[PDB]
């Protein structure tokens, strides 16, 4: 059993939602949940880690993410 890491997702308005994901989780699942909770279409948003686009099938392992890393959300637009 691998552990969850907790990521902070920062919106355009500086609001924050934190997500627990495993190192092998495909990050589309985070994107979909975030968009759902914001009440906007997932394709209206782009999700960045250190300024680089997060793909649907990127994993935290591929991106080298760790506990407390930040994802920023911008309009696609």
């Amino acid at each position: 059993e691998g552990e969850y890491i907790k990521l902070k997702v920062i919106g355009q308005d500086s609001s924050e939602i934190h997500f627990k994901v495993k190192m092998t989780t495909h990050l589309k699942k985070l994107k979909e949940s975030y968009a759902q909770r914001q009440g906007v279409p997932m394709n209206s948003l782009r999700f960045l880690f250190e300024g680089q686009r997060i793909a649907d099938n990127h994993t935290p392992k591929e991106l080298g993410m760790e506990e407390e890393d930040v994802i920023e959300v911008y309009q696609e637009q």
């Binding site: 907790k6 934190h18 997500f19 627990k20 495993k22 989780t25 699942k29 949940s33 909770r37």
Partner: peptide, 15 residues
């Protein structure tokens, strides 16, 4: 705002 943490986690079928 309060802290928000979200956890990202057929033979019986009838349709």
């Amino acid at each position: 705002a309060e802290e928000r943490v979200v956890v990202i986690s057929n033979s019986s079928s009838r349709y």
